[PDB]
RNA sequence: GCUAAACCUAGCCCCAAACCCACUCCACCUUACUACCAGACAACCUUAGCCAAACCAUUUACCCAAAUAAAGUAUAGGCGAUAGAAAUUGAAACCUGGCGCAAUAGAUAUAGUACCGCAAGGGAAAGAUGAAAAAUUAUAACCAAGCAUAAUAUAGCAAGGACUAACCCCUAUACCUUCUGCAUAAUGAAUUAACUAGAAAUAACUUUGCAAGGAGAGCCAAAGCUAAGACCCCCGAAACCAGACGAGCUACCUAAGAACAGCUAAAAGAGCACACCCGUCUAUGUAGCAAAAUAGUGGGAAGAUUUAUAGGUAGAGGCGACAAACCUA
RNA sequence: CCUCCGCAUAAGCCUGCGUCAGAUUAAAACACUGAACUGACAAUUAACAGCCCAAUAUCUACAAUCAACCAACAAGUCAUUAUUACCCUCACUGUCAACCCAACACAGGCAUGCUCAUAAGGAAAGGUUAAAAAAAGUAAAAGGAACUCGGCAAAUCUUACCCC
RNA sequence: UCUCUUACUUUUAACCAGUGAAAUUGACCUGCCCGUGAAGAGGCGGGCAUAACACAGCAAGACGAGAAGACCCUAUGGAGCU
C-alpha cells in the first residue's frame, strides 16, 4: 500500500501501483528527469471536473471537462477531446476495438472558462473577505465555483446503507466521556470488579 | 503486548495484567494433513504457548488443550536487481488441539462464484469487446487475401 | 482479496485509538508529575563520543553493586575527538553539497524559463 | 568547504555554548587566565636586550620554557614546580657524535607535614624544592595560600588550597571548642587571604568537576503542572473577583 | 562473468484501466447496430420508384 | 568466510549457542537446581477482556456521520474539565486551602498506589 | 567510433546581458576617483589570493598560512603532502641548473 | 546487415556567506541488536622514518598567532647541503559565483552495496525512445575492429612505374627504441574506441609607458625603472619507519575428552597385520581431479601415538627433538 | 554391473531437486524436465539437546584395567556433613535439504556410534570404426640382467659382506 | 630390462550430433641451393622450383611459447649473518 518510489521516477499516465506502470518503469530504470515548472499549492486553480478550454493542439478552441489531474508533471486530460487512437483487445490472430485515448495537456495550454460568456479566461486567487477562498475572474470579475466531483472513496453519502459492521450516527457522537484523573487501567479494573491487595515493591531504575 | 517494556516482578508483587493487547493472529489452513482437533495458527514472534492459551480462552472462549509452537525460517536466497539479498520475514506458527473432543475443518471461502451485476464501467466495454469479436471474425480462405469490405 | 481497504481502515482506526489513549495518559502524567516521556532515562555519552539518550532498564539491585552495568563505559577517552571532528567534517561536506546542488537546480529552472 | 572558526577556538566556543556558559564568571576567568609559570629547570636572562660577542649590537632576547611532563604521581602529591624532562642528549657534549634520548626524573622523598589551619598531619611524596619553598614561605599553609595555581602543579595542592580558603571564609569552629582564642589567633595570622565563600568553592576545580557541581545545583526535579494550573486559576479568579 | 539478458516484454494489451482507477475511457461509438434493417427480398425487383 | 551481513539469530551457533539466544519472548520464571523451569503465575500476562454482550458499537462507522476538526487533548483542557469546577466551587465558598490539595486528586508521590505514572508500573 | 551523429542543440548567448554590458565598470577607479580604493579591492574571490599572483607552490604556501588553521583535516593533510612534493619537485628535479 | 554506434542528466569540483547535527514504540558493551542479581580492573608518556648532503654517522622547511614590507637580512649550520628570525610599518564593515567536468570525465559511489580477504582492510561496473507506452507505429537508415552478402589462381614487406585488362613485366631488406652499426634470428606491438606524459626562478631578448628618475608606501638607479611575452615530463623497484590485525593452517603449551579389529602375546616407546597417521620408490598429470592429486609399492600402527573442542604465546617478535623450519596457499 | 559404502550424532551452511504456473528467453557443460531457475504457497510441533543450583563453616589417603589372585609405575578420570532459608510448577531455543572447507556439481580435507557387506547406497559405455603415437592391464617360443649410472619397473619370494 | 619384439582388452584416438577453453599472434600473397650481411636468411644477389584447396601423422627449422636469466658483471641499489 505504502511503497517508496525511486527519487527520479517518471510519472506515466497510470496509477503508480498499477501493473502497466511497473512494466513501463520498474526499479531497474534510470532516465533523464522531466524538468517541470514548480507551482505552489495555493495558486493552482483548475480542479478535476471544471470546464476548460484547449488553447493549442490538433483541435484548438474546443471546450470539455477535465477527468484527471496529475500534479507531479502539471498535466490535465480533457475528457475525449485531445485524443489519438489505439487498439485494446490485442492477440496474435485478431485485434480490433479501436478506442479514442486522450493525451495530457500542460497548464499553460489550458485556460479556465467562466459560465456567463463561455470564453477562455485568466484567473486570480482573490481572497474573499467573508472568510473563505474561491477563484475570481480577472477580466469579467465573476466568481468561478469549485465544481463538485465524486470523491476518491467511491461512496456517495446520500445513497449509503449501513451494514452490520458499521456503527450508526447516533452512537458514534454520543458524549460518554467523563474526564477524570484516574488512568484507563485502574478505571476498568474497578469497573470489572477486579481487586488486588498486594503492593508493588521498590525497583531500581538505571 | 509486544514492543512494550514489561514491569519487573519483585517477589510477592501483584498480577501482571495486560489490558489492550497488541497481538494479531492468523488462522491458517495447514499444508500437510492434520488430525481432527489440530488447529494451526500463525502468531507474532513475541508470543508464547500460555499467551496463546489465555488469548484463545479469553476472547474467543475456545477450549484449548495443548499448544505447541515452532519458529519458521523465511527464505533469504532471492537476489534483488543489484545482487543484494531480499529477506522473507520469519514467523511462528502454532498448533493447538481442542479440549472436549470438538472438531474443526478449514472452510472454503472462495466457492462458489454466482454474480452478474449491471455493467457500465467495465462490462459495457466487455460487451463491446465480445460484440466486435463475434462480428468481425468472418475471415474467409476462398477470398485469398482481398479485403472483405468493398461491395464491389 | 475481496476488499483490501478494510484492513488499512482497521489498522489506522486502531492506531487512532492508540493515539487517543496515549494522549490521555500523557496528559495525566503531565498533570500529576509534570514529566513527559514515561520511560525514564538520561542524556549520556558513550564510548564513540556520540551523545545518546540512554533509557533505563528496570533492575532489582542498585547500580553500584551491579557487575554487568559496571562494564559498560559512558565516557569519551580522548583519542575519539579526532574521529568526532572527521565525522563533523563529513556531515558538513554532505550539507554543503546538498545546498550547492539546490542552487544549481534553481539556476537551471531559471535558465529554462 | 571551510570552518567558520579556527580549530583552536572550539574550546572557548564550547565554553560559551551550553552548561559551561552558566558557570559563574570568576571560574571562567580563572580558566582563561593562562599565565606563565615560574622558571624551574632553566636559567632566565637578566635583561631583555643582550649585547653579544662578535658584533657589538644589542639583540632582543626572550626566555623559552621547557616542555616538562608530570606523571599522575605528581598529581597525587606536592612536587615543586618540577616534573620529568623528556629530551635528547649529545653523547660527549659535542654535536659530531650520536643523539641519544634522556630523561631527568627528580629525586623524591616522603616527609610528613603539619597544617596549622586544617590541623591534620599529611604524608606527602614531596621533593626538595617544595621544602625550600616552604622554608622561604615560613610555613606550609603560607606556601599553599601564597603560590598561585600554575606553580603548585598538583591537584592535591589545589584541594589543600580550597580547603584552607573554605576554612578561612566560613570562620568555622576549626580546631575544637574550649579554645576559640586559638581559633582567632590562627584566623588572624592568615588574614591577608580569605576570598568570600561562594567564590571559595570553585578554586582549583577542573572543568569536569565544575560541570558535575553545576549540574548538581540545577538538578531540580520538575514541578507538577497541577500546582502551576491551580495558581493560574486562583490568580485569574482573584483578578475577576477583585474587579 | 555474471551477466544475463534483459527486456522481458509482452505483446498483448489488456484491460489494465479497470484494474483500478478513477478515470474511465470516453468512447465515441458503440459496439454494432441496434436492430438490423431487413431489406425486402425483391428490392431489385422493386428497383423502380414504387409498386 | 562466514556470513557477515545477515543478522544473528538463534539457528546459527553450536549446541550451547542454540537456546541461550531466544527470539524475544518475555521469560516467565527461573531455572532451579534440577534443570526444571519454575513458572510464576504473577509473571504470565493475564488478558483482561470485557464482556461484549450488550455492546452496541461496530468496528466501522457510517459515512453519513459528520466530520469534526481535530483538537489534541492537552493538560490544560483536562485540568479545566476535571479539576477547575471543584476548585472553583470551593473557592466561591472560601473553603479552598492551598496547603492540602490531595482531595482534588493530586498525588504528591506515586509510591503509594498500584499504577504509578512516571515509572509506569502498568504495562499497556 | 567517436563522432556524434546528430548535430547538437544550437547554443544561444545574450551578449546584452546584465553582466556582459556592465563588464569592467568601476574598474580603473583609483585613477579617476582620487585614489580612495585600489582596483585589487574590486576582486571577489578566495580570501588568500586577493590581489596576489604567485606560483603554484606559492599559492599553496599562502593557503596554508592564511586559511589552513580552519581547513578540513583531509584537505590539510593533502595540502601538506602537496607542498612537500612541490618543494621536492621545484628545488631538486627539473632542467636549467 | 548482424554484432553494433550516437545521446543529456543524474550528479560532482573549486570558492563566498554562514559555526553544524543527533529518542515515534522496543532492543543494543554478555556471543552487541539478548527484560530481570554482590568485586567494585580502568586515560594522562620526546613521534619515528623515506629523502638531501650525489655515500653516511650531527644536520634536512612540515610546528596551526590573517596580508605586504623589513628579508631571504641579522643569525645557525661535517660554517655544507640547507635552515632562518626579530625591532618597526600597516591589514575599507554588505552583495546567491565559475574563459570547472559531463557516465573510461567529475567524489570510489546507483555504493562503501555486490564481491575478495578469518581479521585490519581492498573495492568495482552501469542509464539513454518519446508531448502522450492509457500510442507498440514502422521506420529512419548512413560511420571502427570482427563476419556475411562475395574462398582460392605460379612469385615472394604486399607497394610504386605503368599499361587496353587485377595477376603476369622492371624496382623496392616493415616501424619505434637502444646502439659505431638492426631486415636482422635484439627489445615492444592481435586489432579497434577512449584515456595517457615539459609545472618554475635569477639573469638575458623583444615590445609598450615614463625619464635622472621609475614604480599605487617597502625596491632599484653613473640611462635607468615598471609591465607583458617567452623556459625547464610520465610509469616502474627490492627497501625504512609508526600504528593497527591475526595461533580456525602450521610451531609449542594448557583444561577436560575420544580411538586403536585379529594373531603371535617372552615382560616389551616388542613382531605381522585392519581402521588411522606419514609420504621411500615408480608411472599418469603439468591452464591437471588437485595453486602438490591419482594408481601401484611403502614406514609406523598400546605409544616420544593419532585426533575432535576451547584457551594462551605476534613481528626490534612468538615458536622451534636447529630444518634460519613454521607464523592463513 | 559396482559398492573402500551407507544411516544417524557432533561441527559447519542457512531453505539450497516439495506443489503450481513460466518454460518464449534465461543455467542443464546435450535435451527430457531438472541438483548449476523465475515467481507464489506450505513445512522442521518434544519426551531427543541446550537453557541450571540459597548461603556460612566443615568433610573428601586406599586408582583404572570383568577387579576376584598375582603384579606394578608414568602414581591416577567421579563421594559429604551441621544450621538457617525454601512449599509455586513444565516457559524459551534447534529439529528441512541431494548440505561443510577448498574461486566450481573439485579422484582433495572432515570428529563419534552402528551391520564390516550388506535390509543401506550407486552407474565405468552420447552413437559408429578399429588408423598412427600415448597411458593402464593380460599372455608369450629359446636364453634368464647379456639393458641400464644403478635389478629403475615387473615376476618370484630371496643369501652373505662393508660404511654410517 | 634386453637379444627382438608380437597378439588381445580398456582408456586414448579417427568419423556423426551438442556445448564449448587456454598459452600465442607487427603484417604476411609464408619454397630449395650457394654466397652475402649485426658474423647461422622464406623476404638481399645468382640460379633452381612453382595450378589452387583441405583431412591424418612427424618434430629438422621459425636463433618456437609460458618466467624484464636463477650462471657472470655493474649500481657511491637493498637485506640476512658474524
Ligand atoms: Mg643521501
Ligand atoms: Mg563513474
Ligand atoms: Mg566494418
Ligand atoms: Mg617479382
Ligand atoms: Mg643493412
Ligand atoms: Mg614516434
Ligand atoms: Mg653492441
Ligand atoms: Mg625481431
Ligand atoms: Mg635489450
Ligand atoms: Mg611480443
Ligand atoms: Mg589451536
Ligand atoms: Mg610395536
Ligand atoms: Mg631416496
Ligand atoms: Mg608393524
Ligand atoms: Mg643447519
Ligand atoms: Mg533429521
Ligand atoms: Mg583451489
Ligand atoms: Mg538399493
Ligand atoms: Mg557414464
Ligand atoms: Mg565417446
Ligand atoms: Mg619369454
Ligand atoms: Mg651391464
Ligand atoms: Mg623394485
Ligand atoms: Mg648461408
Ligand atoms: Mg623471420
Ligand atoms: Mg625460446
Ligand atoms: Mg633483465
Ligand atoms: Mg662508482
Ligand atoms: Mg649505498
Ligand atoms: Mg640506504
Ligand atoms: Mg632490519
Curated annotation (Swiss-Prot), chain A:
Q: Which Pfam families match?
A: KOW, ribosomal_L24
Q: Which domain of life is it from?
A: Eukaryota
Q: Which UniProt keywords apply?
A: Mitochondrion, Phosphoprotein, Ribonucleoprotein, Ribosomal protein, Transit peptide
Q: Sorted alphabetically, which PROSITE patterns does this protein's record hold?
A: RIBOSOMAL_L24
Query: Which InterPro entries does this chain map to?
Result: KOW, Rib_uL2_dom2, Ribosomal_uL24, Ribosomal_uL24_CS, Ribosomal_uL24_KOW, Translation_prot_SH3-like_sf
What GO molecular function annotation could you give as one example from this UniProt entry? Answer: RNA binding
Gene Ontology biological process terms in this record: mitochondrial translation; translation
Record-level GO cellular component terms:
mitochondrial inner membrane; mitochondrial large ribosomal subunit; mitochondrion
Classification via SUPFAM superfamilies:
Translation proteins SH3-like domain
Subunit info? Component of the mitochondrial large ribosomal subunit (mt-LSU). Mature mammalian 55S mitochondrial ribosomes consist of a small (28S) and a large (39S) subunit. The 28S small subunit contains a 12S ribosomal RNA (12S mt-rRNA) and 30 different proteins. The 39S large subunit contains a 16S rRNA (16S mt-rRNA), a copy of mitochondrial valine transfer RNA (mt-tRNA(Val)), which plays an integral structural role, and 52 different proteins.
Q: What is this protein called?
A: Large ribosomal subunit protein uL24m
Q: Which organism is it from?
A: Homo sapiens
* Gene of this entry: MRPL24
Curated annotation (Swiss-Prot), chain B:
> Where found in the cell?
Mitochondrion
Superkingdom classification of source: Eukaryota
What keywords are annotated for this sequence in UniProt? Mitochondrion, Ribonucleoprotein, Ribosomal protein
GO MF terms held by the record: RNA binding; structural constituent of ribosome
Sequence ranges of Basic and acidic residues compositional bias? 130-143
Disordered: where is this region? 107-152
Xref: SUPFAM superfamilies: Ribosomal proteins S24e, L23 and L15e
Q: Which InterPro entries match?
A: Nucleotide-bd_a/b_plait_sf, Ribosomal_uL23-like, Ribosomal_uL23/eL15/eS24_sf
Task: List GO BP terms, alphabetically.
Answer: mitochondrial translation; translation
Question: Which cysteines share a disulfide bond?
Answer: none
Question: What assembly does the database describe for this protein?
Answer: Component of the mitochondrial large ribosomal subunit (mt-LSU). Mature mammalian 55S mitochondrial ribosomes consist of a small (28S) and a large (39S) subunit. The 28S small subunit contains a 12S ribosomal RNA (12S mt-rRNA) and 30 different proteins. The 39S large subunit contains a 16S rRNA (16S mt-rRNA), a copy of mitochondrial valine transfer RNA (mt-tRNA(Val)), which plays an integral structural role, and 52 different proteins.
Family indicated by similarity: Belongs to the universal ribosomal protein uL23 family.
| Designated name of the protein | Large ribosomal subunit protein uL23m
Organism whose genome encodes this protein: Homo sapiens (Human)
The gene that this protein is the product of is MRPL23
UniProtKB/Swiss-Prot annotation, chain C:
Name this protein carries in UniProt: Large ribosomal subunit protein uL29m
Assembly, per entry: Component of the mitochondrial large ribosomal subunit (mt-LSU). Mature mammalian 55S mitochondrial ribosomes consist of a small (28S) and a large (39S) subunit. The 28S small subunit contains a 12S ribosomal RNA (12S mt-rRNA) and 30 different proteins. The 39S large subunit contains a 16S rRNA (16S mt-rRNA), a copy of mitochondrial valine transfer RNA (mt-tRNA(Val)), which plays an integral structural role, and 52 different proteins.
Q: Which residues of the full protein are shown?
A: 126 to 238 of 250
Natural source organism = Homo sapiens (Human)
Localization recorded for this chain is: Mitochondrion
Q: Record's superkingdom?
A: Eukaryota
Family note? Belongs to the universal ribosomal protein uL29 family.
| Modification N6-acetyllysine occurs at | 19
Swiss-Prot record, chain E:
Q: Organism's domain of life?
A: Eukaryota
Localization, per the record, is:
Mitochondrion
Family the UniProt entry places it in: Belongs to the mitochondrion-specific ribosomal protein mL45 family.
Q: How does it assemble?
A: Component of the mitochondrial large ribosomal subunit (mt-LSU). Mature mammalian 55S mitochondrial ribosomes consist of a small (28S) and a large (39S) subunit. The 28S small subunit contains a 12S ribosomal RNA (12S mt-rRNA) and 30 different proteins. The 39S large subunit contains a 16S rRNA (16S mt-rRNA), a copy of mitochondrial valine transfer RNA (mt-tRNA(Val)), which plays an integral structural role, and 52 different proteins.
Biological function: Component of the mitochondrial large ribosomal subunit (mt-LSU). Within the mitochondrial ribosomes, required to direct the nascent polypeptide toward the tunnel exit and position the exit at a distance from the membrane surface.
Q: Can you say what this protein is called?
A: Large ribosomal subunit protein mL45
In the complete protein, the residues contained here run: 52 to 102 of 306
